[model samples]
Target: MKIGDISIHYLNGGNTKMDGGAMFGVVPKPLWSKQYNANERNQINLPTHPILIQTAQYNLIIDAGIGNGKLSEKQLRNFGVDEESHIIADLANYNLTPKDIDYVLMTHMHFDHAAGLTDQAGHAIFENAIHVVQQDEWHEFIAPNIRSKSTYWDKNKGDYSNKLILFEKHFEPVPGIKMQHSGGHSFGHTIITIESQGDKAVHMGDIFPTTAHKNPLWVTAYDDYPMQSIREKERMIPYFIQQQYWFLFYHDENYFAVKYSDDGENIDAYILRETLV
Candidate 1:
């Protein structure tokens, strides 16, 4: 889809099945399962993917998905990862290659999100692109606490040392693209916004992982700071609804994006993944 002069593409990395209870914390399974069905094990299928934004000057990728060969058989069984990442092959569909990418905007350093930063041997896949991450996240990646150290792997950090670009607060690598620090999912978790020619779109990272998570009160158990997530959502949802901005999702299985009704009670427009390509 075109957001003003910029072109956006959704690339599928793979899919994973996560515990439904953890995904919708405090919400009853009966209520949450109405939107997405769960398996016998009470797990919901989610897409681990990335969005490619093509501007006049740059090719920017948001949230690199779990990369190929990053998980072992045991890990795959545990995470319920059904397929290996095909991000590079998917990019080839648009006649683009990894070398063609100019920037990678990391929302956070979680294993499922930032594992794709490097290959199995810890080599940067996008050899020419600069990896942009929040300064706090960068620090966490290098030296994480016992709670975070498990997800912050050495491979994701070691190879990209030279290419890493750490920013504080907010950053705009391009004219209309903005990355605002929103501490919810992680201390350095961020939400991104793109504005062009009066139209705007927002990617709310893990704070609002799926469309079903639109409610500010509903948060995931996986969040490090659940209260912060709730507060941030309370602050942004009104503005987003008022502006009728296109909201993008990274983990949603059915819808890729959606625009809310003027009253913010219903969806005015829904963009599905199948409809895009």
Candidate 2:
């Protein structure tokens, strides 16, 4: 896909899982159980991918999935780990190398989001790319707490030789790629908005994990502010339906991308393409 002369690729880094109750906040299992099923551990599967954007100026990679050889015994057992280092392998399938990447736009610094930022030896993975993270989240990660501790791994806080950019608010990752205020999933969460060929697509990090999140009331219990997430969903739904904007669900296993439509103001998704948003 061309985004104002930028060639974008959706790289399948891998997949992971989180509890469904936490994934669908306030939305009772009775409602969600009918639409989706959770594993024996009460977790819902989510897809993980690094959005790759190749512009005339630079090669940009979105959030890297979980890093290789870093899973804990608990994580491995709970999520049923079968693979860990597929990002590089998947990128290789496209005839590209990790060193070829020039910029990494981290949506947030959650463990799964930032794990692949560094190598197994706890060094920066992309020697040439600048890893961008939200300033507030970075501060939150360093604070004394258990919840934050679990989300912020050593790789996220370790020194990366100053190849980092921290921001307080929304900004463009590059010429054609922009970040917007889409918080509520976390303290400093932001959804990426990409435009190309007069079309717009929003890579909603975790605000809407799946197409099942299309309902305005549906949200992740993991959300720092479930109500705020609901509001964000409501705010984006009309725009998604009115403009026919492509909404990319990062963790959606069935449909990777989709647009919205409304019947008397009640919106629902209309899948556009399966991948490469």
Candidate 3:
């Protein structure tokens, strides 16, 4: 929808059915299962729906998805990633192209998200866009430890290096848009905000992975810093509610964006799909 002349859209980056236990860690199966029914495989749908925000000034992408053919056959089976991203086509729906994107901000560099930065041959997909990333996140991504090595692949190391814009802690590339490092899911995970006139939106990267994770305590077992994730959410969720900003989700299955009631208690309304408006 048009948020005061700044258009915000959710595009299909890809889809993945990850294990529910890892998605909602420490939360008992009975309780978590109530929110997101897991298949017989105990897998929950954790599709990647990247946000595309556009202003007269420039077009920006919140997170990229698993690119086409980026995963090996075995990896696809292991990750349950049935569909890979067709971001180029997804952009065309808005009459835009990858070159039309001025910025591509990563929430983190997990394989699911960063895999879209390049093609299978390590070619930058959005060739003209400045690939914005957090410095710390880049560091960890480039030199991943044992635990992180599984998700932070070596193939991702050089593809976007030519176009990367690594920032320290915070950056506001556009006048009303904000990108702040939120080190919860990864050392460089970030939360973004886009505002114009009086309308605003908060992109809760992995901090609020899905609608089922609105509760701050529910974080993925994959998070490098689960407590940090909870702390960041505790500090920001209420702020977003109070500010009446739209919550743009990247991993939710049911909704793209939603805003709470004035009291910050309920979902007074929501945008279920990009075609809704």
The superposed Cα distance between candidate 2 and the true structure at residue 243, in angstroms, equals 1.6
Candidate 3 to truth, TM: 0.96
The model with the greatest lDDT is 1
lDDT of each: 0.86, 0.72, 0.85
Q: Tell me the tens digit of each residue's lDDT in model 3 across 100-132.
A: 999988888898888888886788888888888
- TM-score versus the correct structure, for each prediction: 0.96, 0.88, 0.96
Task: Write model 1 residue lDDT over 142-233, tens digit each, in one string.
Answer: 89999888778776754566788889899998888999899888999999998889888999999999989989988988888999999999
| Model 2 residue 275 CA deviation in Å | 9.8
lDDT at position 111, candidate 1:
83
Clashing pairs in 2: 22-221
Candidate 2, residues 1-277: lDDT per residue as tens digits? 5446766666666668778887777888888876676877887767677777777768878788776766676876666545664778777876778888878887777876777777766777777788777777777766726776777766455545378888777888777688776678888887888776677777878887777877878887777877778888888777766776767665676765666664424336544325332
lDDT of 1 at 252: 91
lDDT at 179 for candidate 1?
Answer: 95
